Enzyme design. Structure first.
Site, PDB file in Angstrom:
ATOM      1  N   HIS A 159       0.807  -1.222   0.000  1.00  0.00           N
ATOM      2  CA  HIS A 159       0.000   0.000   0.000  1.00  0.00           C
ATOM      3  C   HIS A 159       0.851   1.289   0.000  1.00  0.00           C
ATOM      4  CE1 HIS A 159       0.107   1.217   4.274  1.00  0.00           C
ATOM      5  NE2 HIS A 159      -0.163  -0.032   4.643  1.00  0.00           N
ATOM      6  N   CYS A 206       3.520   1.798   9.482  1.00  0.00           N
ATOM      7  CA  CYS A 206       3.384   0.693   8.527  1.00  0.00           C
ATOM      8  C   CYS A 206       4.738   0.208   8.087  1.00  0.00           C
ATOM      9  CB  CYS A 206       2.538   1.115   7.338  1.00  0.00           C
ATOM     10  SG  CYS A 206       0.826   1.470   7.770  1.00  0.00           S
ATOM     11  N   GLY A 251       2.360   6.166  10.040  1.00  0.00           N
ATOM     12  CA  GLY A 251       3.782   6.107   9.729  1.00  0.00           C
ATOM     13  C   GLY A 251       4.459   4.848  10.240  1.00  0.00           C
TER      14      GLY A 251
HETATM   15  O1  LIG Z   1      -4.573   1.805   8.706  1.00  0.00           O
HETATM   16  C1  LIG Z   1      -3.909   2.613   8.080  1.00  0.00           C
HETATM   17  N1  LIG Z   1      -2.867   3.289   8.663  1.00  0.00           N
HETATM   18  C2  LIG Z   1      -2.516   3.060  10.036  1.00  0.00           C
HETATM   19  C3  LIG Z   1      -1.795   1.926  10.405  1.00  0.00           C
HETATM   20  N2  LIG Z   1      -1.429   1.615  11.656  1.00  0.00           N
HETATM   21  C4  LIG Z   1      -1.767   2.459  12.621  1.00  0.00           C
HETATM   22  C5  LIG Z   1      -2.489   3.659  12.406  1.00  0.00           C
HETATM   23  C6  LIG Z   1      -2.853   4.541  13.453  1.00  0.00           C
HETATM   24  C7  LIG Z   1      -3.573   5.673  13.192  1.00  0.00           C
HETATM   25  C8  LIG Z   1      -3.958   5.982  11.896  1.00  0.00           C
HETATM   26  C9  LIG Z   1      -3.625   5.161  10.855  1.00  0.00           C
HETATM   27  C10 LIG Z   1      -2.881   3.972  11.071  1.00  0.00           C
HETATM   28  C11 LIG Z   1      -1.734   3.856   7.914  1.00  0.00           C
HETATM   29  C12 LIG Z   1      -2.166   4.392   6.566  1.00  0.00           C
HETATM   30  C13 LIG Z   1      -2.999   3.351   5.830  1.00  0.00           C
HETATM   31  C14 LIG Z   1      -4.258   2.943   6.629  1.00  0.00           C
HETATM   32  C15 LIG Z   1      -5.214   4.161   6.648  1.00  0.00           C
HETATM   33  C16 LIG Z   1      -6.638   3.775   6.976  1.00  0.00           C
HETATM   34  N3  LIG Z   1      -7.090   2.729   6.083  1.00  0.00           N
HETATM   35  C17 LIG Z   1      -6.292   1.664   5.760  1.00  0.00           C
HETATM   36  C18 LIG Z   1      -6.876   0.508   5.243  1.00  0.00           C
HETATM   37  C19 LIG Z   1      -6.090  -0.575   4.900  1.00  0.00           C
HETATM   38  C20 LIG Z   1      -4.720  -0.489   5.049  1.00  0.00           C
HETATM   39 CL1  LIG Z   1      -3.738  -1.875   4.660  1.00  0.00          CL
HETATM   40  C21 LIG Z   1      -4.110   0.648   5.546  1.00  0.00           C
HETATM   41  C22 LIG Z   1      -4.901   1.729   5.936  1.00  0.00           C
END
Ligand SMILES: O=C1N(c2cncc3ccccc23)CCC[C@]12CCNc1ccc(Cl)cc12
Ligand SMILES: O=C1N(c2cncc3ccccc23)CCC[C@]12CCNc1ccc(Cl)cc12
Ligand SMILES: [Cl-]
Lengths: 302, 299
Positions: A41, A145, A143
Site C-alpha cells: 500500500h 506501517c 507512519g
Molecule cells: O490503517 C492505516 N494506517 C494506520 C496503520 N497503523 C496504525 C495507524 C494509526 C492511526 C492511523 C492510521 C494507522 C496507515 C495508513 C494506511 C491505513 C489508513 C486507513 N485505512 C487503511 C486501510 C487498509 C490499510 Cl492496509 C491501511 C490503511
C-alpha cells in the site's frame, strides 16, 4: 524470580529498518540482503485505498519512483516485484547488518516482539500476541506501517509479522513476510471489522504455571476436570477451546510443578467463576494470555 | 492507537554486553571504550579492597562474543569493578552515566553469559527496588534510556531481595536504596504507588478513547495528597502538576481534575471495568513515556 512481559533484544532488527517513500506516502521497510520488504500500500494514495488494483498501480511505477533511505544513505532501487501484499524492492547494496533470518508464519496465540518504527527509525520495542481473531493489540501510529514482528532463536531472527493497518477498534492487522495477511483482512479502506476476540486459554494456563513456579499457589484447588467439561465452561467466558495439543504442550510445565494440566484447568475454571477477590497473580489483577508455554519455560527457567 | 509497555530499542546496548568470569562466578559486563564495568561481587562480610588486591588482571576472563578481551588494569568505584581492557569497543555508542530518581522508568536488557536474552521496561520504585525479571547469571545486566542517539546508562543489576524484587546501582556503583552488596538480612521497604505516573497513564487512557473514569469534579492539591497518603500513593507535588501540563492541555482535563478521577478510583475501585486493558492503576509510565509513545519519537 520475577515475571515480566519481555521482548527480544531488537538490535538485529534495528539494523534492517529503512524508510520507503513513494510519492507522498512514507512508511518503513525491512532491508535483508539486497531486498527491501514493505507493505504494497506504499504505492496507493488515500483515494486508491478503497478499491486499489495493485498490479495496475505497480506497472505504472519505475525503480526511481521508490526512494529508499537507510540512515543518511539513499539506497538505489534496481527492481521491484509484488508477492501477495508485500512489495519487494531490489536494491543495489546488500545490508551488511543482515542477521541470520527466516520468514515464519505464526498461529493465533503465538507471541512476538514488535519494533515500532517511524521514518525508518526504531522508536520502541514491545511484546504482543497474534489474537485468536488474527489481530494484534499493538501500539502503532500513522507512519508505523512496515514495522515488523519477530522472535529470536539463538542467533536467528524469525520475522513473522509486518504491520499494514489499524482497524476501527484500535487493533492492528498485518501480514507475514510473504505478504499473506493474518485473518480475513485486505489492504483496502473497505468496511472491515475485527471478529469477536477470545482469550488464549493455553497461554493463561502457561501463565498460571509461571505463577506456581514463582511461588503463587492461592488459586489452586483440590479439583480436576475433564477436557470437555473445561471447554464447556471456557467457551462461556469467551475463552478459546483447549485442545489435546495444548494439553500436550503444557506437559513440561505440569511435570515441573507437579500440577496436572486438567488440575490447572480446574483452577482456571474457579478463577473464571470467582474472580481474584482483591488478589493478584504475578502482579496482575486480570488473567494474562500473552505468554505462551514456550515463553514461560524461556523466562522462568532459561 | 494502542498503549503498550514499551522499551527503548536495545541495539546500542547489545553491542556493549560482555561476559565476565572470575573464579567460579560468571556475570555480565558493560564494555564502553576500553573499560568493562561489572558488579564488584564478581571478585567474591566481604572486604572488597582486600579481595581485589589479591586478584591480578589475568584472573578476570572477559569474553565479547567469541573473542576473549585481555584485561590490562582493574579498579573499583563504589560497588562497580572497572576492568581496563586492551581493545576499545568499536560498537561504543554515544553515552552518559545518569543516576535516576524513584518513579523514573528505564529499559533493562537482561543478559546471561554476556548474551542479551530480553528487554523489558520498568520503573525505579519509591522503595528503590525494581520489579524485574532476573535469574542467576543476570548480574551486570543494565538499565538505560535513549535520548536522540545518546544512551543514558542508569542501572546495573547486582541482587535479588527475598520478596523477588531487585536491587542494583547506578553505573558509578552507588546503590539505589539502602542496600549493600553482601549476603545479609536485607528487605525491600514498604512500597508506594508512583502517583504522577498513574495520572500520566490515565491521560494516556483518555488519549486512546477511555473516558469512563472522568468526572465533573476537581480537587485541591492538599485534599488529593490527604487521600493519596491514605492509599500508599506518593505525594503529588507542584512539579508533578507542571510536568503533566502538556497532557492536561492536549486532553482538556486539568491535572487536579484528573486527580478527582484518581481519588474516585481509589475510593470506589474500577467496578468490573478496565483502563487500557488493566484492572489495576498502572504506575510504570512517566508523563514523558506517555508523550513519547503517543507521538512516535524515534532513535
Ligand atoms: O490503517 C492505516 N494506517 C494506520 C496503520 N497503523 C496504525 C495507524 C494509526 C492511526 C492511523 C492510521 C494507522 C496507515 C495508513 C494506511 C491505513 C489508513 C486507513 N485505512 C487503511 C486501510 C487498509 C490499510 Cl492496509 C491501511 C490503511
Ligand atoms: O542476589 C544474588 N543473585 C541473584 C541476582 N538476581 C537474581 C537472582 C535470582 C535467583 C537467585 C539469585 C539471584 C546472583 C548471585 C549473587 C546474589 C546471591 C545471593 N546473595 C547475594 C548477596 C549480595 C549480592 Cl550483591 C548478590 C547476591
Ligand atoms: Cl506459531
Amino acid at each position: 524470580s520475577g515475571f515480566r512481559k519481555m521482548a527480544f533484544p531488537s538490535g538485529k532488527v534495528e539494523g534492517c529498518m529503512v524508510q520507503v517513500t513513494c510519492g507522498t506516502t512514507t512508511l518503513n521497510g525491512l532491508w535483508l540482503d539486497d531486498v527491501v520488504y514493505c507493505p504494497r500500500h506504499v504505492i496507493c494514495t488515500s483515494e486508491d485505498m478503497l478499491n486499489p488494483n495493485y498490479e495496475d498501480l505497480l506497472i505504472r511505477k519505475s525503480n526511481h519512483n521508490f526512494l529508499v533511505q537507510a540512515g543518511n544513505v539513499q539506497l538505489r532501487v534496481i527492481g521491484h516485484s509484488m508477492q501477495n501484499c508485500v512489495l519487494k524492492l531490489k536494491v543495489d547494496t546488500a545490508n551488511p547488518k543482515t542477521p541470520k533470518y527466516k520468514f515464519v508464519r505464526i498461529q493465533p496465540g503465538q507471541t512476538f516482539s514488535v519494533l515500532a518504527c517511524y521514518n525508518g527509525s526504531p522508536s520502541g520495542v514491545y511484546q504482543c500476541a497474534m489474537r485468536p481473531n488474527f489481530t494484534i493489540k499493538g501500539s502503532f501510529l500513522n507512519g508505523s506501517c512496515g514495522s515488523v514482528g519477530f522472535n529470536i532463536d539463538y542467533d536467528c531472527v524469525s520475522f513473522c509479522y509486518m504491520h499494514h493497518m489499524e482497524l476501527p477498534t484500535g487493533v492492528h492487522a498485518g501480514t507475514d513476510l510473504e505478504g499473506n495477511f493474518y485473518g480475513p483482512f485486505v489492504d483496502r479502506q473497505t468496511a472491515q471489522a475485527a471478529g469477536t476476540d477470545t482469550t488464549i486459554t493455553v497461554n493463561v494456563l502457561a501463565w498460571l504455571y509461571a505463577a506456581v513456579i514463582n511461588g503463587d499457589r492461592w488459586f489452586l484447588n483440590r479439583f480436576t476436570t475433564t477436557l470437555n467439561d473445561f471447554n464447556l465452561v471456557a467457551m462461556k467466558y469467551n475463552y478459546e477451546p483447549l485442545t489435546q495439543d495444548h494439553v500436550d504442550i503444557l506437559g513440561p510445565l505440569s511435570a515441573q510443578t507437579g500440577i496436572a494440566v486438567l488440575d490447572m484447568c480446574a483452577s482456571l475454571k474457579e478463577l473464571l467463576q470467582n474472580g481474584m477477590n482483591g488478589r493478584t497473580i504475578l502482579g496482575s489483577a486480570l488473567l494474562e494470555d500473552e505468554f505462551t508455554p514456550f515463553d514461560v519455560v524461556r523466562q522462568c527457567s532459561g
